[PDB]
Amino acid sequence: GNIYNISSANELNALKLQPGDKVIFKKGNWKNQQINFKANGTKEKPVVLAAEKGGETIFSGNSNLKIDGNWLVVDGFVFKDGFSEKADVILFTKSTSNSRITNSSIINYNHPDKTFDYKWLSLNGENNRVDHCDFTGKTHQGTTLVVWLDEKPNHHQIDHNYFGPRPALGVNGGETIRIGTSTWSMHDSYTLVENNIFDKCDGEMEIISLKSGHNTVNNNLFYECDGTVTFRHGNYNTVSNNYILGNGKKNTGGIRIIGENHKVFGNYLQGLDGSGLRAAISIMSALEKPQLHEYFQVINPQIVGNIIADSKEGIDIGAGKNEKRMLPPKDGFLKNNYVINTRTVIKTENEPEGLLIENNQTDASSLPKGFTKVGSDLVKSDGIWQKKNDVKTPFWKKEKIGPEWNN
Amino acid sequence: GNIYNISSANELNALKLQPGDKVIFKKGNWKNQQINFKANGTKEKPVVLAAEKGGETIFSGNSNLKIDGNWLVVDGFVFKDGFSEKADVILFTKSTSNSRITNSSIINYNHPDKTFDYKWLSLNGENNRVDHCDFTGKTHQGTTLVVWLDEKPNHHQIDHNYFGPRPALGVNGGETIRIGTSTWSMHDSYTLVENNIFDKCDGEMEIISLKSGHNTVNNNLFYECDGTVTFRHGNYNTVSNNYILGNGKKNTGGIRIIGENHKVFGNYLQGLDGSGLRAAISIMSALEKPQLHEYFQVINPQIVGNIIADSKEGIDIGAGKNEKRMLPPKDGFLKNNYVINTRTVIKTENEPEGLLIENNQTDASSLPKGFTKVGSDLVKSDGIWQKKNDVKTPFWKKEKIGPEWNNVKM
Ligand SMILES: O=C(O)C1=C[C@H](O)[C@H](O)[C@H](O[C@H]2[C@H](O)[C@H](O)[C@H](O[C@H]3[C@H](O)[C@H](O)[C@H](O[C@H]4[C@H](O)[C@H](O)[C@H](O)O[C@H]4C(=O)O)O[C@H]3C(=O)O)O[C@H]2C(=O)O)O1
Ligand SMILES: O=C(O)C1=C[C@H](O)[C@H](O)[C@H](O[C@H]2[C@H](O)[C@H](O)[C@H](O[C@H]3[C@H](O)[C@H](O)[C@H](O)O[C@H]3C(=O)O)O[C@H]2C(=O)O)O1
């Protein structure tokens, strides 16, 4: 197709784009750009909106980007020195399918009013991808990246991004990633959050809030995060092969489980300071007849192959128990987990019903039922305690995370 | 305020409008107009986008309107001789409040593909108004006018519009008005549909589909409509003072009740050819533990003062009963209703539980339980049987329905 070198969102609007067209935004700092990337491409010929030189096309002031259409690719942009007046910084519309944003950044794009809500990235539509991006420094109301649910699963892919430091919001709505809302929580989303770094994401209790079904949070790093990866609403979610490395940092929590048929496996939950709701593996108590926005009993959780090391509290069965939250976790199993150099191996706030605890290993002098002394050889490679027969280089050591043009 | 005189959507894009401005789109037929009416007005000084003369600014080809802002008024435009390529023809964004569309039309604006889905008017946000508009001739997939539910009630108002002929679509998605989806059915909408005419809206089973709560379908005319006003999902909805005049036309139905705490009162249900689900008042059976998209047991239905005349079937109690749908209507009352010159006055498919049926007058020789012999309380005025003391001029006989610039007649 054609290559169009532009220096304004107006020029992009006065353009008719066909598959294979590439729009190149001139390098520089462009203020108050309302970009509407509205076009349609194909798998073999997508329409591309790329920066002249990666990381050198800045959108300052009140600049926004809307991605509207099929097979669209946005590449190399940086939103800094500004804020949005009302809309989300980056938006994929409901009719936007098979589109992607890559090598892009949103840095300190904060509203002067800390209570003024907007998200930095909103995902809608189907099979859209956010990759090799950088979202750092959100100080105002609103989750950084939202996956907005619909009647059909989205199969969105959020991968290889760097979610930088997010200061404590003080109130709810400060998550890094929220997948769904309580109304859409009984719907399947099928979102994949994979190979991302969540560095110092302290916005609120939940770094990731899963509020829909069949999502997968796989092989990510949660580095020194004041929060937890929570299974808030919904069923059939998976939290696997992740590294939650709090580095002894205050209130660094693990994985919080609420709802049914969840799989928590292969995670490294090390150097965590949290307890109760922020335990390395927190299994919550729930209400009898809950509305969507409330708490659903933990039924059939499958917690296997997790290595908890150097932490305050490893497992908390029945966390959050009170007058309304009396229902204990039921069914499922807690098998083949390791709990080393952890002050509390297992806490029980509510006796579980039929939760099978067996073949777990700990270095604790006192073995709680279902735990034995450590029999497998362990190794501390790349700062992480791993099984000597399953030692691997963590993804961030051998892959580029965040923009390609950055370091 | 400022008065702008444009002839293109490109001119509108370059205009920086403030509370009190009025943009006047020049008389003519303009094709492929992508109208983005983005502005913020006030209650005292609104921002109007008006046609030079109502009905004389035509948007043909692939034209679309987006109403994105506060206190905005769109007035006098016609969408015809074209179709939407992807988007709904007229849209109120989720960021829109206190905005209005009046004296406007969408006429046979059909995509060449009958299965291609887009709505003609889409409502989002809150306190928005669609009035004095003409929506006629939808042949392709999709509900004509949609109220899209959100987390807070909308309080939208749909009034004095003319919804003209809609051919049968043959599948779901052929409603005239859908207020919500089963996902949002337990949410309050607070939408009002009042003083509109639904003329020959044969799109599908439901002329109007209520899939949310606290809605009011009041004082409308459904003339020769192949379908029903269905309380599909949601509770506390009201269907009152409507004229459902089938005029003997094949499968013309009435009001279909599903769910809880609904009110059905003062309706004239006459010349209906429908039975079972399409009876004048059809009170459905339901599943024991249903999902939000299925059928919820009819609880506390309050059916009073309905004048059912010249129909195939008056009331069907337990309509749609099957092996799954066994829960019958419970509680509430069916009282002060009139059923005259009707083949089956009241049919009972599933025996109701605790349903009060008293003071219902009819002319059928064998009086059913809770029915008394009708006297001379009713009179046939304007071709509509009415209670003598309550005789009135129908709203459509004395009000402009549809655009002010159009001399419409059924
Ligand atoms: O440990 C906890 O996290 C927790 C403990 C407390 O006891 C509370 O129960 C607390 O509840 C929160 C839950 O996440 C709950 O499902 C719900 O979420 C709301 C909340 O407003 C979110 O910020 C959010 O927002 C959406 C949503 O559509 C909302 O209705 C509104 O329109 O705004 C948007 C938006 O753009 O942000 O999601 C909501 C939702 O899922 O319904 O309430 C929370 C709360 O009350 O704090 O959990
Ligand atoms: O109207 C009926 O009598 C009816 C009978 C069928 O047996 C079935 O239960 C049917 O389901 C329809 C109903 O409107 C549901 O709420 C649902 O609706 C969705 C549908 O795709 C529709 O076009 C619109 O988009 O609303 C959707 C929603 O989820 O609300 O399905 C309908 C269907 O035909 O399956 O009602």
JSON list of C-alpha atoms in Angstrom, two decimals, chain A residues 130-259:
[
{"chain": "A", "resi": 130, "resn": "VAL", "atom": "CA", "xyz": [-1.51, -5.08, 23.66]},
{"chain": "A", "resi": 131, "resn": "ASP", "atom": "CA", "xyz": [2.16, -5.93, 23.59]},
{"chain": "A", "resi": 132, "resn": "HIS", "atom": "CA", "xyz": [5.63, -4.47, 24.22]},
{"chain": "A", "resi": 133, "resn": "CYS", "atom": "CA", "xyz": [4.07, -1.41, 25.85]},
{"chain": "A", "resi": 134, "resn": "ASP", "atom": "CA", "xyz": [4.89, 0.66, 28.95]},
{"chain": "A", "resi": 135, "resn": "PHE", "atom": "CA", "xyz": [2.22, 2.00, 31.32]},
{"chain": "A", "resi": 136, "resn": "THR", "atom": "CA", "xyz": [3.90, 3.82, 34.21]},
{"chain": "A", "resi": 137, "resn": "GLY", "atom": "CA", "xyz": [2.80, 6.25, 36.96]},
{"chain": "A", "resi": 138, "resn": "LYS", "atom": "CA", "xyz": [-1.00, 6.44, 37.24]},
{"chain": "A", "resi": 139, "resn": "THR", "atom": "CA", "xyz": [-2.10, 8.68, 40.12]},
{"chain": "A", "resi": 140, "resn": "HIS", "atom": "CA", "xyz": [-5.78, 9.32, 39.37]},
{"chain": "A", "resi": 141, "resn": "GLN", "atom": "CA", "xyz": [-8.97, 7.19, 39.64]},
{"chain": "A", "resi": 142, "resn": "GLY", "atom": "CA", "xyz": [-9.46, 4.29, 37.19]},
{"chain": "A", "resi": 143, "resn": "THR", "atom": "CA", "xyz": [-7.81, 0.92, 36.47]},
{"chain": "A", "resi": 144, "resn": "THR", "atom": "CA", "xyz": [-4.71, 1.28, 34.19]},
{"chain": "A", "resi": 145, "resn": "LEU", "atom": "CA", "xyz": [-5.82, -1.36, 31.65]},
{"chain": "A", "resi": 146, "resn": "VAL", "atom": "CA", "xyz": [-9.38, -2.61, 31.44]},
{"chain": "A", "resi": 147, "resn": "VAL", "atom": "CA", "xyz": [-10.77, -5.51, 29.47]},
{"chain": "A", "resi": 148, "resn": "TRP", "atom": "CA", "xyz": [-14.44, -4.62, 28.95]},
{"chain": "A", "resi": 149, "resn": "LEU", "atom": "CA", "xyz": [-16.63, -7.70, 28.68]},
{"chain": "A", "resi": 150, "resn": "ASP", "atom": "CA", "xyz": [-19.34, -8.46, 26.11]},
{"chain": "A", "resi": 151, "resn": "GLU", "atom": "CA", "xyz": [-21.72, -11.35, 25.16]},
{"chain": "A", "resi": 152, "resn": "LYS", "atom": "CA", "xyz": [-18.95, -13.19, 23.27]},
{"chain": "A", "resi": 153, "resn": "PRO", "atom": "CA", "xyz": [-15.45, -14.16, 24.60]},
{"chain": "A", "resi": 154, "resn": "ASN", "atom": "CA", "xyz": [-12.78, -11.65, 23.50]},
{"chain": "A", "resi": 155, "resn": "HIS", "atom": "CA", "xyz": [-9.63, -13.81, 23.43]},
{"chain": "A", "resi": 156, "resn": "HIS", "atom": "CA", "xyz": [-7.58, -10.63, 24.04]},
{"chain": "A", "resi": 157, "resn": "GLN", "atom": "CA", "xyz": [-3.82, -10.93, 24.49]},
{"chain": "A", "resi": 158, "resn": "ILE", "atom": "CA", "xyz": [-1.90, -8.66, 26.87]},
{"chain": "A", "resi": 159, "resn": "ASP", "atom": "CA", "xyz": [1.76, -9.68, 26.64]},
{"chain": "A", "resi": 160, "resn": "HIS", "atom": "CA", "xyz": [5.37, -8.51, 27.10]},
{"chain": "A", "resi": 161, "resn": "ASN", "atom": "CA", "xyz": [4.40, -5.20, 28.67]},
{"chain": "A", "resi": 162, "resn": "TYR", "atom": "CA", "xyz": [6.02, -3.31, 31.50]},
{"chain": "A", "resi": 163, "resn": "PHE", "atom": "CA", "xyz": [3.48, -2.02, 33.96]},
{"chain": "A", "resi": 164, "resn": "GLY", "atom": "CA", "xyz": [5.66, 0.34, 35.95]},
{"chain": "A", "resi": 165, "resn": "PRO", "atom": "CA", "xyz": [5.25, 1.92, 39.38]},
{"chain": "A", "resi": 166, "resn": "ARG", "atom": "CA", "xyz": [1.64, 2.83, 40.29]},
{"chain": "A", "resi": 167, "resn": "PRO", "atom": "CA", "xyz": [1.25, 4.81, 43.54]},
{"chain": "A", "resi": 168, "resn": "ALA", "atom": "CA", "xyz": [-1.40, 3.83, 46.16]},
{"chain": "A", "resi": 169, "resn": "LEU", "atom": "CA", "xyz": [-4.79, 5.27, 45.16]},
{"chain": "A", "resi": 170, "resn": "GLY", "atom": "CA", "xyz": [-6.31, 4.89, 48.65]},
{"chain": "A", "resi": 171, "resn": "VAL", "atom": "CA", "xyz": [-9.70, 3.88, 47.21]},
{"chain": "A", "resi": 172, "resn": "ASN", "atom": "CA", "xyz": [-11.03, 1.09, 44.88]},
{"chain": "A", "resi": 173, "resn": "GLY", "atom": "CA", "xyz": [-10.45, 1.46, 41.13]},
{"chain": "A", "resi": 174, "resn": "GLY", "atom": "CA", "xyz": [-6.66, 1.49, 41.30]},
{"chain": "A", "resi": 175, "resn": "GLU", "atom": "CA", "xyz": [-5.96, -1.95, 39.75]},
{"chain": "A", "resi": 176, "resn": "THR", "atom": "CA", "xyz": [-3.39, -2.42, 37.06]},
{"chain": "A", "resi": 177, "resn": "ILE", "atom": "CA", "xyz": [-5.54, -4.84, 35.06]},
{"chain": "A", "resi": 178, "resn": "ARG", "atom": "CA", "xyz": [-9.26, -5.45, 35.55]},
{"chain": "A", "resi": 179, "resn": "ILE", "atom": "CA", "xyz": [-10.84, -8.15, 33.41]},
{"chain": "A", "resi": 180, "resn": "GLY", "atom": "CA", "xyz": [-14.57, -7.68, 33.49]},
{"chain": "A", "resi": 181, "resn": "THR", "atom": "CA", "xyz": [-17.07, -6.21, 36.01]},
{"chain": "A", "resi": 182, "resn": "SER", "atom": "CA", "xyz": [-19.49, -7.93, 38.46]},
{"chain": "A", "resi": 183, "resn": "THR", "atom": "CA", "xyz": [-22.37, -7.77, 35.87]},
{"chain": "A", "resi": 184, "resn": "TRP", "atom": "CA", "xyz": [-20.26, -9.56, 33.23]},
{"chain": "A", "resi": 185, "resn": "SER", "atom": "CA", "xyz": [-18.57, -11.93, 35.71]},
{"chain": "A", "resi": 186, "resn": "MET", "atom": "CA", "xyz": [-20.65, -15.03, 34.78]},
{"chain": "A", "resi": 187, "resn": "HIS", "atom": "CA", "xyz": [-19.54, -14.50, 31.10]},
{"chain": "A", "resi": 188, "resn": "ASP", "atom": "CA", "xyz": [-16.37, -15.99, 29.61]},
{"chain": "A", "resi": 189, "resn": "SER", "atom": "CA", "xyz": [-13.67, -13.57, 28.49]},
{"chain": "A", "resi": 190, "resn": "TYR", "atom": "CA", "xyz": [-10.79, -15.92, 27.54]},
{"chain": "A", "resi": 191, "resn": "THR", "atom": "CA", "xyz": [-8.18, -13.12, 28.03]},
{"chain": "A", "resi": 192, "resn": "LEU", "atom": "CA", "xyz": [-4.47, -14.00, 28.18]},
{"chain": "A", "resi": 193, "resn": "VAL", "atom": "CA", "xyz": [-2.16, -11.92, 30.39]},
{"chain": "A", "resi": 194, "resn": "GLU", "atom": "CA", "xyz": [1.30, -13.34, 29.73]},
{"chain": "A", "resi": 195, "resn": "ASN", "atom": "CA", "xyz": [5.04, -12.47, 30.07]},
{"chain": "A", "resi": 196, "resn": "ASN", "atom": "CA", "xyz": [4.39, -9.03, 31.51]},
{"chain": "A", "resi": 197, "resn": "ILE", "atom": "CA", "xyz": [6.30, -7.28, 34.33]},
{"chain": "A", "resi": 198, "resn": "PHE", "atom": "CA", "xyz": [4.21, -5.56, 37.05]},
{"chain": "A", "resi": 199, "resn": "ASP", "atom": "CA", "xyz": [6.86, -3.45, 38.79]},
{"chain": "A", "resi": 200, "resn": "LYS", "atom": "CA", "xyz": [5.83, -1.67, 42.00]},
{"chain": "A", "resi": 201, "resn": "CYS", "atom": "CA", "xyz": [2.13, -1.70, 40.99]},
{"chain": "A", "resi": 202, "resn": "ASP", "atom": "CA", "xyz": [0.76, -0.39, 44.30]},
{"chain": "A", "resi": 203, "resn": "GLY", "atom": "CA", "xyz": [-2.50, 1.23, 43.13]},
{"chain": "A", "resi": 204, "resn": "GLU", "atom": "CA", "xyz": [-4.66, -0.93, 45.35]},
{"chain": "A", "resi": 205, "resn": "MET", "atom": "CA", "xyz": [-5.23, -4.38, 47.00]},
{"chain": "A", "resi": 206, "resn": "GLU", "atom": "CA", "xyz": [-5.77, -5.94, 43.57]},
{"chain": "A", "resi": 207, "resn": "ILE", "atom": "CA", "xyz": [-2.93, -5.63, 41.03]},
{"chain": "A", "resi": 208, "resn": "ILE", "atom": "CA", "xyz": [-5.04, -7.86, 38.70]},
{"chain": "A", "resi": 209, "resn": "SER", "atom": "CA", "xyz": [-8.80, -8.18, 39.25]},
{"chain": "A", "resi": 210, "resn": "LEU", "atom": "CA", "xyz": [-10.40, -11.12, 37.45]},
{"chain": "A", "resi": 211, "resn": "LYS", "atom": "CA", "xyz": [-14.17, -10.48, 37.13]},
{"chain": "A", "resi": 212, "resn": "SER", "atom": "CA", "xyz": [-15.17, -12.87, 34.28]},
{"chain": "A", "resi": 213, "resn": "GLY", "atom": "CA", "xyz": [-14.40, -16.54, 33.32]},
{"chain": "A", "resi": 214, "resn": "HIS", "atom": "CA", "xyz": [-11.88, -18.67, 31.39]},
{"chain": "A", "resi": 215, "resn": "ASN", "atom": "CA", "xyz": [-9.05, -16.04, 31.70]},
{"chain": "A", "resi": 216, "resn": "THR", "atom": "CA", "xyz": [-5.33, -16.99, 31.96]},
{"chain": "A", "resi": 217, "resn": "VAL", "atom": "CA", "xyz": [-2.66, -15.07, 33.86]},
{"chain": "A", "resi": 218, "resn": "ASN", "atom": "CA", "xyz": [0.47, -17.01, 32.79]},
{"chain": "A", "resi": 219, "resn": "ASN", "atom": "CA", "xyz": [4.18, -16.56, 33.39]},
{"chain": "A", "resi": 220, "resn": "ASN", "atom": "CA", "xyz": [4.27, -12.91, 34.55]},
{"chain": "A", "resi": 221, "resn": "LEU", "atom": "CA", "xyz": [6.46, -11.08, 37.11]},
{"chain": "A", "resi": 222, "resn": "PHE", "atom": "CA", "xyz": [4.88, -9.09, 39.97]},
{"chain": "A", "resi": 223, "resn": "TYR", "atom": "CA", "xyz": [7.95, -7.35, 41.35]},
{"chain": "A", "resi": 224, "resn": "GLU", "atom": "CA", "xyz": [7.61, -5.61, 44.77]},
{"chain": "A", "resi": 225, "resn": "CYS", "atom": "CA", "xyz": [3.83, -5.07, 44.26]},
{"chain": "A", "resi": 226, "resn": "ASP", "atom": "CA", "xyz": [1.73, -3.71, 47.06]},
{"chain": "A", "resi": 227, "resn": "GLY", "atom": "CA", "xyz": [-1.20, -5.93, 46.21]},
{"chain": "A", "resi": 228, "resn": "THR", "atom": "CA", "xyz": [-2.42, -9.38, 45.10]},
{"chain": "A", "resi": 229, "resn": "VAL", "atom": "CA", "xyz": [-3.53, -11.23, 41.95]},
{"chain": "A", "resi": 230, "resn": "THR", "atom": "CA", "xyz": [-7.21, -11.70, 42.77]},
{"chain": "A", "resi": 231, "resn": "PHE", "atom": "CA", "xyz": [-9.87, -14.03, 41.37]},
{"chain": "A", "resi": 232, "resn": "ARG", "atom": "CA", "xyz": [-12.61, -11.44, 42.24]},
{"chain": "A", "resi": 233, "resn": "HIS", "atom": "CA", "xyz": [-15.70, -12.67, 40.31]},
{"chain": "A", "resi": 234, "resn": "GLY", "atom": "CA", "xyz": [-16.17, -15.58, 37.91]},
{"chain": "A", "resi": 235, "resn": "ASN", "atom": "CA", "xyz": [-15.13, -19.16, 37.38]},
{"chain": "A", "resi": 236, "resn": "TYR", "atom": "CA", "xyz": [-12.60, -21.34, 35.38]},
{"chain": "A", "resi": 237, "resn": "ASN", "atom": "CA", "xyz": [-9.69, -18.89, 35.68]},
{"chain": "A", "resi": 238, "resn": "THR", "atom": "CA", "xyz": [-6.02, -19.87, 35.73]},
{"chain": "A", "resi": 239, "resn": "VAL", "atom": "CA", "xyz": [-3.09, -18.22, 37.49]},
{"chain": "A", "resi": 240, "resn": "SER", "atom": "CA", "xyz": [-0.01, -20.19, 36.46]},
{"chain": "A", "resi": 241, "resn": "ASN", "atom": "CA", "xyz": [3.78, -20.14, 36.20]},
{"chain": "A", "resi": 242, "resn": "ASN", "atom": "CA", "xyz": [3.92, -16.56, 37.59]},
{"chain": "A", "resi": 243, "resn": "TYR", "atom": "CA", "xyz": [6.61, -15.02, 39.78]},
{"chain": "A", "resi": 244, "resn": "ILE", "atom": "CA", "xyz": [5.34, -12.84, 42.58]},
{"chain": "A", "resi": 245, "resn": "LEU", "atom": "CA", "xyz": [8.58, -11.56, 44.07]},
{"chain": "A", "resi": 246, "resn": "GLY", "atom": "CA", "xyz": [7.89, -8.99, 46.78]},
{"chain": "A", "resi": 247, "resn": "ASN", "atom": "CA", "xyz": [11.55, -8.70, 47.87]},
{"chain": "A", "resi": 248, "resn": "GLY", "atom": "CA", "xyz": [10.49, -8.46, 51.55]},
{"chain": "A", "resi": 249, "resn": "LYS", "atom": "CA", "xyz": [8.48, -5.29, 50.67]},
{"chain": "A", "resi": 250, "resn": "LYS", "atom": "CA", "xyz": [5.58, -4.39, 53.01]},
{"chain": "A", "resi": 251, "resn": "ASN", "atom": "CA", "xyz": [2.16, -5.92, 52.24]},
{"chain": "A", "resi": 252, "resn": "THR", "atom": "CA", "xyz": [3.37, -7.72, 49.07]},
{"chain": "A", "resi": 253, "resn": "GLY", "atom": "CA", "xyz": [0.62, -10.27, 48.66]},
{"chain": "A", "resi": 254, "resn": "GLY", "atom": "CA", "xyz": [0.10, -13.41, 46.68]},
{"chain": "A", "resi": 255, "resn": "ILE", "atom": "CA", "xyz": [-2.87, -14.92, 44.85]},
{"chain": "A", "resi": 256, "resn": "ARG", "atom": "CA", "xyz": [-6.36, -14.41, 46.33]},
{"chain": "A", "resi": 257, "resn": "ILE", "atom": "CA", "xyz": [-9.02, -17.03, 45.40]},
{"chain": "A", "resi": 258, "resn": "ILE", "atom": "CA", "xyz": [-12.81, -16.43, 45.35]},
{"chain": "A", "resi": 259, "resn": "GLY", "atom": "CA", "xyz": [-15.25, -18.35, 43.09]}
]
